[PDB]
Specification:
The structure is cut from a larger assembly and holds three copies of chain A. Chain A is α/β, with parallel strands linked by helices and 752 residues long. Chain A has six domains: 95 residues, Barwin-like endoglucanases; 89 residues, Vcp-like ATPase, Chain A, domain 2 (Roll), CATH 3.10.330.10; 166 residues, Rossmann fold, CATH 3.40.50; 91 residues, Helicase, Ruva Protein, domain 3 (Orthogonal Bundle), CATH 1.10.8.60; 169 residues, P-loop containing nucleotide triphosphate hydrolases (Rossmann fold, 3-Layer(aba) Sandwich); 90 residues, Arc Repressor Mutant, subunit A. Helices cover 40% and strands 15% of the residues of chain A. Chain A contains 28 helices and 22 strands. Chain A has a six-stranded mixed sheet with strand order 2-4-3-6-1-5. Chain A is globular, with a radius of gyration of 36 Å. Chains A and B meet through helix 6, helix 7, helix 11, helix 18 and helix 20 of A and helix 7, helix 12, helix 13, helix 20 and helix 21 of B. Bound molecules: adenosine-5'-triphosphate (4 copies) and magnesium ion (4 copies).
Chain lengths: 752, 449, 172
């Protein structure tokens, strides 16, 4: 249905592009059976449909090596048609070819340099003498000879555009040589093939702009008018302006560009004059496309706007789009970042009827984007874009381009010892050897961060799972929670159940909640957003809920993502307990959080994790399943857990073999992990003191401490203290036992 | 322009977007625009003496028109072009579809009945989308890149009732376009228990739109206000989602605090705007999730804070009184803290009907457990009734998380078996009893006594 | 040869006094390319459409002379978040800048630099890859870094022998 327009349907006339081993610039060779199917004779001029609205005519030839589904074309033909190897183009004989009455040909400015003889007699005179070579306007053909072979472009071919060169034809090279940068820019043109992902959106745009122009007879027959308005809205970097550029490059109809703020002028009423001139100029050339970049710049809400001129401009846009005199085959496209900021009357059927949602690509989409981007660049053999696509979690498509650029820069960094910056030129062997490798992509991935999350970036202490001692069950639960919905969605669809997306950590201070959060941030394969407790709150009325909504929206954009609240009890507390708190600002914030986690909006892959010291004061509506689905209790470590903690802290620090951590873990009862870390730090400080004293003694005698020993740990344990009192443990156990009594059965069993 | 009207009599002057040149002079910050307004007033005061010239003006927002232009003697007669009704929509479809190549299977009465708030431009959008889909059907025969089209395809082109059904599925009113959010697909059979509540909601949504004549006969106004209060996780938002999905009435869903803005006067403007766009698409359902955020006991903000929330609640009360009984606007509010709600909004005439969603009972828990697993394969040896008996005070969300924990355990077992297989090289088609065992061990009651 | 476009965006952010404007001066003096200075407050004007005209004129002047470097000093003042700002002219200027950096017609050889004390004030659209490719953090110097700064500063000074710059670097 919708995807059908992107399908080629494997038409017999369309054929595979293949290399031309022997065919010259002006001829093509195909299989003789293909002539049999196409009813073509040798020497017939054939018109080849090419991308970016480029067409070239060549002399057909019979070749056995050319495959039936393939066509052999020289590099010149591919350049003129803007077609790459392996693409699919059709062949059609040129209709009613007339011999060229006159030809104007222009060289390229880079090749003409160093050519001692004049180009016409050296290149044009022998090449075109009895050539009988078909050419096209805008085609560049390479001519051998001279100190460098010269590419020649026939800017004007007469008769336009169907012609054959003959010896009697007048040949001149007068005029400025065609700029090589112009040639590259004509090569660097974006087409519909360039857009990656969002295939359905591209199909809808093709139906909007390409179908009416190609086949107006269909809509004339049915007696309907095709849509005349397209709004492309989405987060920054999805590719709206890229689609606009592709449509501009590959539509025969006229293209008119309007930048939003560019309309504004100092004189009174001059903006309306500019808009009227733009629309009238579009109407002058009948089938035309108007692209209004940044529509939200010139079309704010009329009720919201406080400026008179802006309201008059939006009214002028409304009247131009719809009025007494309706438009005559004029398509208006606008790309906006904020679709809600547009005036409501503009979003009606008359003016902007079709809204196209350019959204965040999924994994296969960003794989396709990576393939399209990396087709041009040089790559090694070990590169594997599937892994890179899997790693790039929340990236949008501009971020993928950033990743490619960073990897290329790293690759060039690697060859810096051979290269000299001061040198004017680099050795050709270096550029031949220089290429992108998988190491470059891995390093760029390490450096890469989504553009949406750039504001919420926090440096993390680089903790790994092995640094946390104990809590093995909690570690496995966290890894399963973050992994299963992402890596294995098919299982959940098979069982037809949505995953759980909430975890709350509650326990005595120093037990390992923020440590687990650091481990998840460093290790797990999902974007991490860290929110301190009260940083969302703001003086102004209604700003706090705006911040909460904005941060949840950022989490949804970068899905899969993890949202961590370090101190949940600060931001979410039992409602109605505030004598002040502004105009119930705390309660409104809590309500906003409640509606964000579990609301009528469809659930997306965002996991909310919270850590709290007092879980009792937390509002009951938060703890209801569907918000903070699972409550995990982080207890004081046991003797085995204490052994694991003491091992984990001391792995990097050199410690004497006689020191037995099991005895420390045996006596230390009720100590938190923080207390054990403090004991180890005190032992380290005592060792530092001893080493410094020995160094001072050596300096004095001028006028040791290889590892921490048993006496250091003895003194540290003398200084050690038990952080968490018994009563706090009692209140946490009271909360836990209330929950367990709510469970009501330590053991459960089905009757059999 | 007025002189040219005088030159050729009779003359008609049409002013399109009158609000563009006729804003309230006090709201205007420029002298030239004020002079334009006064000049319009003076030219039309002179118009009063003239013989054969009549001026008509069209505006989207009548309020923005300067009050003098609405004064007696100025635009004395004012026509409200209301949204079309069902017969009006059918007439619009008949007018617009006479040109199109409609098939015989299409009947326009069903299409007219299906749409709720379409104002006529949406009907043209519906027809154009259906024609586009019809093109897509024949678009496999003849491709875009093909330069010509078979005449047989041209004859074969037709608009079927399937295309209109597709367009109706895709259709959305223009007013709702600003306030559309994706809602998970929920039906009534998906919800477990609360059969009486389902019936009541269906009746209150269906009766005024379907049968106003009965209420007119018996002389009672329909009750437009419904309040949901109950323990968290009992299914208020689920009922709202089901209403949004199946009901043949437009749905506007707004979070509580999202209306408030820092700028002076913007919050009341947002309240008026949301109620206006609710009235425009009647019959429409207006849902205030987390009502306790907006509506709070009066004087608390006045005592502490700015006090603009008081103006917000006053504006909501003023608007919710303002709408007429004939207008088909229904207001649903869900809160889990009914005590903190301002008692003024509970007063009869506003949100007069109250519904208490209880913590589910025994058979209700059985129904909930069945509903959660209607799509999930489960071994027959598992007895849901026993879970219902054992889980006395559990809410619906607790039963759901027990089922989801069982699913997670099944997934863990399947994954470990798979990785064992790949390790050997180089299970659980349905959830069993032991998964539910471990889920019940992890289970806990969400709502305290 | 590698097949990628060079990065065209630089953002320098750090606490005041770290040396961002000094880096801009060094780049302007040390490179063989056109340099155009843009100060955030100076572009905007009370007239309607004058600020947009100033931005377009500056980018066009940079476009004419290639390669070009544009340094936008105090970008935070000129480019606030569009959601937060209420003034219409500021939104128009931000949108014009967004279009100028990356639009349907893209800059060929213009490399744009900016210095700001608070990077978070900048609009999230500008921080995208296409507009400002990478953000460079000019941070608090370390002990060795500030020793290096002291050596650079005191080169032009006349010093006596007793001056010990390592001690001064340690104390500060
Ligand atoms: N789908 C895509 N396929 C290929 N490249 C893409 C795609 N999406 C984005 N890009 C790349 O990202 C950039 C496109 O950014 P673009 O100008 O389209 O953004 P935008 O949506 O207009 O942003 P803004 O909101 O700032 O207006 C280019 O560098 C392009 O190569
Ligand atoms: N299981 C553990 N393994 C290793 N170190 C641990 C462990 N538990 C705690 N620590 C130590 O505790 C310190 C960090 O404590 P953490 O941030 O986890 O506290 P918390 O219990 O979340 O408390 P708070 O509520 O105060 O944030 C570090 O010194 C860390 O080494
Ligand atoms: N009757 C029910 N049938 C099926 N599922 C239910 C039922 N009641 C609750 N649930 C489950 O619980 C969740 C629905 O909770 P809902 O949003 O309706 O709660 P609420 O009453 O609005 O509470 P809150 O005060 O937390 O907003 C879903 O996960 C749904 O599967
Ligand atoms: N790294 C450095 N090395 C040498 N001198 C420095 C360095 N950083 C700063 N200075 C000196 O301090 C002066 C002030 O620094 P500069 O004006 O560059 O700061 P800035 O970060 O741009 O400040 P602002 O926030 O005011 O724009 C410089 O002109 C220079 O003399
Ligand atoms: Mg853009
Ligand atoms: Mg913490
Ligand atoms: Mg709810
Ligand atoms: Mg400075």
């Amino acid at each position: 249905l919708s995807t059908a327009i992107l399908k080629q349907k494997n038409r017999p006339n369309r054929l595979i592009v293949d290399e031309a081993i022997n065919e010259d610039n002006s001829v093509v060779s195909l299989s003789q059976p293909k002539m049999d199917e196409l009813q073509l004779f040798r020497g017939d001029t054939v018109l080849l449909k090419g991308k970016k609205r480029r067409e070239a005519v060549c002399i057909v030839l019979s070749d056995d090596t050319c495959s039936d589904e393939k066509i052999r074309m020289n590099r010149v033909v591919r350049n003129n048609l803007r077609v790459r190897l392996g693409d699919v183009i059709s062949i059609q004989p040129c209709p009613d070819v007339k011999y060229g009455k006159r030809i104007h040909v222009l060289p390229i400015d880079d090749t003409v340099e160093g050519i001692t003889g004049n180009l016409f007699e050296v290149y044009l005179k022998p090449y075109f003498l009895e050539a009988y070579r078909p050419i096209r306007k805008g085609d560049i053909f390479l001519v051998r000879g001279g100190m460098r072979a010269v590419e020649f472009k026939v800017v004007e071919t007469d008769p336009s555009p169907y012609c054959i060169v003959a010896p009697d034809t007048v040949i001149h090279c007068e005029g400025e040589p065609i700029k090589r940068e112009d040639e590259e820019e004509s090569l660097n043109e974006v087409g519909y093939d360039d857009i990656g992902g969002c295939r359905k959106q591209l199909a809808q745009i093709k139906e909007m702009v390409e179908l009416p122009l190609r086949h107006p007879a269909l809509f004339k027959e049915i007696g309907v008018k095709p849509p005349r308005g397209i709004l492309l809205y989405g987060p920054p970097g999805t590719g709206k302006t890229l689609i606009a550029r592709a449509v501009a490059n590959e539509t025969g109809a006229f293209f008119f560009l309007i930048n939003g703020p560019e309309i504004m002028s100092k004189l009174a009423g001059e903006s309306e004059s500019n808009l009227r001139k733009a629309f009238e100029e579009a109407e002058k050339n009948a089938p035309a496309i108007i692209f209004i970049d940044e529509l939200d710049a010139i079309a704010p809400k009329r009720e919201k706007t406080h400026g008179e001129v802006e309201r008059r401009i939006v009214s002028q846009l409304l009247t131009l789009m719809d009025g007494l005199k309706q438009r005559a085959h004029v398509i208006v496209m606008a790309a906006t970042n904020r679709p809600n900021s547009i005036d409501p009357a503009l979003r009606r059927f008359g003016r902007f009827d079709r809204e196209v949602d350019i959204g965040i690509p999924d994994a296969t989409g960003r794989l396709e984007i990576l393939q399209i981007h990396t087709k041009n660049m040089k790559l090694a053999d070990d590169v594997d874009l599937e892994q890179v696509a899997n790693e790039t979690h929340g990236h949008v498509g501009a971020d993928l381009a950033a990743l490619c650029s960073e990897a290329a820069l790293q690759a060039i960094r690697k060859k810096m010892d051979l290269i000299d910056l001061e040198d004017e030129t680099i050795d050709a062997e270096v550029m031949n050897s220089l290429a992108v490798t998988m190491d470059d992509f891995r390093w760029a991935l390490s450096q890469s961060n989504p553009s949406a999350l750039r504001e919420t970036v926090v440096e993390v202490p680089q903790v790994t799972w092995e640094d946390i001692g104990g809590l093995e069950d909690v570690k496995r639960e966290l890894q399963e929670l973050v992994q299963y919905p992402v890596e294995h969605p098919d299982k959940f669809l098979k069982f037809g159940m949505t995953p759980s997306k909430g975890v709350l950590f509650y326990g005595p201070p120093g037990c390992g909640k923020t440590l687990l959060a650091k481990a998840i941030a460093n290790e797990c394969q999902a974007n991490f957003i860290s929110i301190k407790g009260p940083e969302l709150l703001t003086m102004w009325f209604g700003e706090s809920e705006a911040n909460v909504r904005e941060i949840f929206d950022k989490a949804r954009q970068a899905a899969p993502c993890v949202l961590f609240f370090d101190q949940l009890d600060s931001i979410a507390k039992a409602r109605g307990g505030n004598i002040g708190d502004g105009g119930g600002a705390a309660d409104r914030v809590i309500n906003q959080i409640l509606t964000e986690m579990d609301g009528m909006s469809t659930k997306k892959n965002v996991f909310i994790i919270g850590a709290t010291n007092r879980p009792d004061i937390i509002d009951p509506a938060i703890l209801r399943p569907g918000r903070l689905d699972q409550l995990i209790y982080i207890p004081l470590p046991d003797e085995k857990s204490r052994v694991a903690i003491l091992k984990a802290n001391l792995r990097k620090s050199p410690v004497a073999k006689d020191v037995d951590l099991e005895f420390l873990a045996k006596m230390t009862n009720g100590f938190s992990g923080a207390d054990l870390t403090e004991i180890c730090q005190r032992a380290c400080k005592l060792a530092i003191r001893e080493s410094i004293e020995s160094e001072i003694r050596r300096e004095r005698e001028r006028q040791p401490v290889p590892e921490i020993r048993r006496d250091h740990f003895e003194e540290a344990m003398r200084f050690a203290r038990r952080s968490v009192s018994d009563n706090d443990i009692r209140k946490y156990e009271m909360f836990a036992q209330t929950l367990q009594q709510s469970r009501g059965f330590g053991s459960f069993r089905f009757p059999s």
